[PDB]
Design an enzyme around this catalytic site. Sequence first.
Site, mmCIF file in Angstrom:
data_model
loop_
_atom_site.group_PDB
_atom_site.id
_atom_site.type_symbol
_atom_site.label_atom_id
_atom_site.label_comp_id
_atom_site.label_asym_id
_atom_site.label_seq_id
_atom_site.Cartn_x
_atom_site.Cartn_y
_atom_site.Cartn_z
ATOM 1 C CB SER A 173 -0.325 -4.943 -3.736
ATOM 2 O OG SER A 173 -1.533 -4.534 -3.118
ATOM 3 N N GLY A 184 0.778 -1.229 0.000
ATOM 4 C CA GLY A 184 0.000 0.000 0.000
ATOM 5 C C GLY A 184 0.810 1.279 0.000
ATOM 6 C CG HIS A 232 -4.388 -8.554 -2.052
ATOM 7 N ND1 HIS A 232 -4.511 -8.022 -3.318
ATOM 8 C CD2 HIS A 232 -3.325 -7.936 -1.484
ATOM 9 C CE1 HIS A 232 -3.551 -7.137 -3.516
ATOM 10 N NE2 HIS A 232 -2.816 -7.068 -2.419
ATOM 11 C CD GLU A 275 -6.824 -9.479 -5.896
ATOM 12 O OE1 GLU A 275 -6.439 -8.855 -4.883
ATOM 13 O OE2 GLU A 275 -6.024 -10.016 -6.697
#
Lengths: 530, 533
Positions: free
Chosen positions: B201, B120, B442, B329
């Site tokens: 990601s 992230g 995920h 996901e």
Amino acid sequence: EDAELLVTVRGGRLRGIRLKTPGGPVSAFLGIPFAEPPMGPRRFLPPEPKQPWSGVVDATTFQSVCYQYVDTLYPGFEGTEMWNPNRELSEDCLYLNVWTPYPRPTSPTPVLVWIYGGGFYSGASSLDVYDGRFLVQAERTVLVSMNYRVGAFGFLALPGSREAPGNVGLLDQRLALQWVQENVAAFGGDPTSVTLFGESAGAASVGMHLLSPPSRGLFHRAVLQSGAPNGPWATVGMGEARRRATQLAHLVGCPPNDTELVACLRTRPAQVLVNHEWHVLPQESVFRFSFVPVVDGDFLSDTPEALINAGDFHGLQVLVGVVKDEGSYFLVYGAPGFSKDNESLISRAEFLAGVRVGVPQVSDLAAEAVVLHYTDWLHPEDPARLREALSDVVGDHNVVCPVAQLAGRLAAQGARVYAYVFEHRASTLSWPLWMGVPHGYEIEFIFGIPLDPSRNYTAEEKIFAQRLMRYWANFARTGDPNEPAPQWPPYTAGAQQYVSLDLRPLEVRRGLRAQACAFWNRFLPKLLSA
Amino acid sequence: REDAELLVTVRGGRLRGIRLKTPGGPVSAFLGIPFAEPPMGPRRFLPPEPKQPWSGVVDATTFQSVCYQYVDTLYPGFEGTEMWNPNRELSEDCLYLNVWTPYPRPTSPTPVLVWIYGGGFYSGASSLDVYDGRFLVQAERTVLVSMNYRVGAFGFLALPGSREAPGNVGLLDQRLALQWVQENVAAFGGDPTSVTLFGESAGAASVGMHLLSPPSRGLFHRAVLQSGAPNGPWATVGMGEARRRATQLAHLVGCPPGGNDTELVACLRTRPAQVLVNHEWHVLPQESVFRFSFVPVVDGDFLSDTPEALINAGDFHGLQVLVGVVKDEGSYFLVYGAPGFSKDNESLISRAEFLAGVRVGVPQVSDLAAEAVVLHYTDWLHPEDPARLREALSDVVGDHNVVCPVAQLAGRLAAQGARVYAYVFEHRASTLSWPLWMGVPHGYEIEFIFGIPLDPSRNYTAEEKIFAQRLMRYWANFARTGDPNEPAPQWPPYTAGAQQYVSLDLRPLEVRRGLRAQACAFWNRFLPKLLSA
Ligand SMILES: *[C@@H]1O[C@H](CO[C@@H]2O[C@@H](C)[C@@H](O)[C@@H](O)[C@@H]2O)[C@@H](O[C@@H]2O[C@H](CO)[C@@H](O)[C@H](O)[C@H]2NC(C)=O)[C@H](O)[C@H]1NC(C)=O
Ligand SMILES: *[C@@H]1O[C@H](CO[C@@H]2O[C@@H](C)[C@@H](O)[C@@H](O)[C@@H]2O)[C@@H](O[C@@H]2O[C@H](CO)[C@@H](O)[C@H](O)[C@H]2NC(C)=O)[C@H](O)[C@H]1NC(C)=O
Ligand SMILES: NC(=O)c1cc[n+](COC[n+]2ccccc2/C=N/O)cc1
Ligand SMILES: NC(=O)c1cc[n+](COC[n+]2ccccc2/C=N/O)cc1
Ligand SMILES: *[C@@H]1O[C@H](CO)[C@@H](O)[C@H](O)[C@H]1NC(C)=O
């Protein structure tokens, strides 16, 4: 002289005619005047009760058809001509018809009152497909049907004005219902057991009588077939109704004072008004009509949707339903690429064009939302899927989801609701096969037309007709279509159960296009408000 | 004395590596190679400067520090989360990269895989066990490279226009590492004319941004995007909201005691790294999942426009891409905020919790937009079935954040000249510690791409080991040839019309159509039109 064919109603004496059916005779009284002729200075005005007469009124034949447009798209084709007027047109058209068993019942017999459809611009109680003789003989009921004014003659409105208040076609309907309360016992009918039933705009009319308190005391149960008062086509706002009334005056040479305008309109021959009706609509469309009921705070104190959401409906039983392919038939009247005579396998361009005609007068965002919901994005250009999808757009938006909203709200608010989908395609159907079971083609089975020996219906279709007449008559007598066999359960907002009607026994299913109707009934309204 | 195989000269000076044992034989590893000056003190928030040359031999014999970052504490001790936590000391001195090469070193140029980790943009590290490059290199005889890049405020705090904190420096860290690969990989036997980026990601979003940034685009030839895309609603932020978040973070830590940017960043530079980390999440405008405080900024420099605009107006002829997602996901993100969700119960939510979860999964949208979401993800014949609601909310988060951004990218690139291959990873590992309702969460295909099941100390199934070997060959075939197929069921290219993809699991390849086409039509075609009107 047959005493069974002589009846005295409040206006005076009537003489009927004895008719033959395959199950025996019935008594018919056709062309009974229930209103003064709405002609000359009475055009656009609420109906007045028929003044009493001396002598005997001849009630042996259907009377004139109210002035209306005559469809000329497939001239001579049985699919369209079955709906066109089969009697002369006249403004002197406010007559009703009574069928009773023969000899006339001497015990109070349940009454069925039929209100024809036709987009509030056409229709007649005299059409072959509305012949009450078979229902009355088979199911021992009294059947009443009436003519009501259509088009501008019934629904031209200058809201607030006394010379064209609007909704007089609905008031014609109310007056015939009052006539039934005052007179139907003279025919052996039970005024305390009146079931209204109608199709399309007739169903919408029935729904509007449910939502108008002065109408509610005149009947006890309701059947709405392929129509609902909350349809996007069934009502119009005061502002738009005034605009359409004014535009039609301009189109027939009347400038542009409400009084001046109606007075000039009253000098025009009825056919002139008919010829220009259609050109007052704002855009190219299908399943929209020029002069329809107006929400002006009088007949309807609010929109049907608002009245349905706020209503207590305990003590009401309603039968509602749809045909399998509600939209298919409207597409040949304006959707590009469609025709009765080919397979109507359209391109995606024509599909997108068809969405704007089928969902008129909305923002581009609303239209794109429709395209999103009705596109299979794994086969976005398949012509057969696109033809089917556009038929579903028109059928869901104008019929299936309005009916489903009505059914869900009334059930959740006290009504006992029975829902059906009519899924049988008549062996005599002349429309092409890709149309499936088109709008309006359950009526002939409800009225028992297949029992007519001069028609080419199969033996199983006659049994099917007798099945449907029994369901409808059971509901009229008790509020429950079930024979007191696989049971027909009530429709509820949660389980959403309905039955399929065809040659096979009853099958219970869930959901009246639940996914599609969540879009039309729950999301799309909020998109348009913001 | 010395092993000539573990001694390499790059442009900065000499390096000494290590010989690693693998189940299939020896690999050479050069771990912790400095590629930038340490971005500490006055260099905090600045773009990376290249590493100055050194005399003597640098020992590149172990993983260097993890870039300073938040450490997840939701399920302490739980391996499903601890496997993503830093496994080295946290430090701002963290700009090091790693090179794995066959032992003996290749005599002919060898294709290069470059890994960009996810997290992230606020976490991650190239040292995690699941990113161990030794198995890919041994099994498929490629050169594998991975780098650390700054995350969180240190990598992506942006005061756009300012010179003291221009933003996107974490992406420049990645670019500098890619420039290092071009200048130095041939010394390890790698082929600089055959470099394949792959990432997961935020790593996948990063890979896509290098595709869309011309200075990066000249540094590699192929791309693999796993469960991420640069056009995701979480992967970029506008200049104004980036400035607001930076200014709020400064206000939260005490800066200034902020008009002038130089002055505000100078005050930010005096704060301990941990204090910035501790307040970093308090700048998010709302309670949300799958949203991150400091992420790449669209400011016209690194990205001259939004990734969606550059994707649409881009010509991708001559480019080969491999994209895909896992089967579930969204499920993994729901235990981090969604009401009623937990890894320790079945998370059978009510309707009210579903509606509350939609606002958390799709933050900062009009109520009309939220209700478009509710309409599409409600089964109106079963509007309150708890198990269906649990799956529906998982689909919302997964479709909106991963699958549909990936599908849009795959579709636009295919229609504009690129050869695309798409997969859905559908095997649930036998060693998975997350509950069964989460399906294939995920991030849990990565260990199979890196060949982790071949580690004998781990208790993977023998069948899963064969599966890992099959996946490593697909990836390496794509890296070598631009085609995952062997030179056997064929993996067809993804096209905007047929939209074919393959399912990856223990069964043979199965070709299917549509990456949740109906759902993604809503997110990719309709919903943006609603957000405009
Ligand atoms: C299906 O028919 C429509 C309507 O065309 C009419 O009906 C046909 C049966 C035939 O008699 C035609 O000659 C008629 O014009 C077709 O749509 C029309 O296509 C013509 C081109 O030939 C075009 O000029 C018109 O504008 C079109 N009108 C509409 C309303 O679409 C349609 O193409 C036919 N589909 C087929 C054959 O697959
Ligand atoms: C399923 O679990 C969630 C998460 O709660 C935590 O995990 C549980 C296993 C239990 O140990 C709780 O005490 C933990 O707090 C439950 O949602 C929480 O419910 C509590 C009290 O009802 C509330 O204070 C929290 O705010 C809730 N958390 C969230 C994210 O909504 C949920 O109720 C459990 N469902 C069951 C047991 O059916
Ligand atoms: N009064 C009129 O001019 C007029 C003309 C046509 N229509 C409608 O067309 C006839 N039609 C007839 C049968 C079925 C559908 C349709 C079209 N519906 O939109 C209504 C009024
Ligand atoms: N810098 C921070 O303080 C911080 C705090 C919380 N999170 C989010 O951690 C929760 N989380 C942890 C692991 C995976 C997903 C998630 C939730 N994503 O929305 C990130 C940074
Ligand atoms: C399973 O794995 C653990 C650590 O990964 C190891 O200690 C253990 O020996 C393995 N086998 C069994 C049967 O637990």
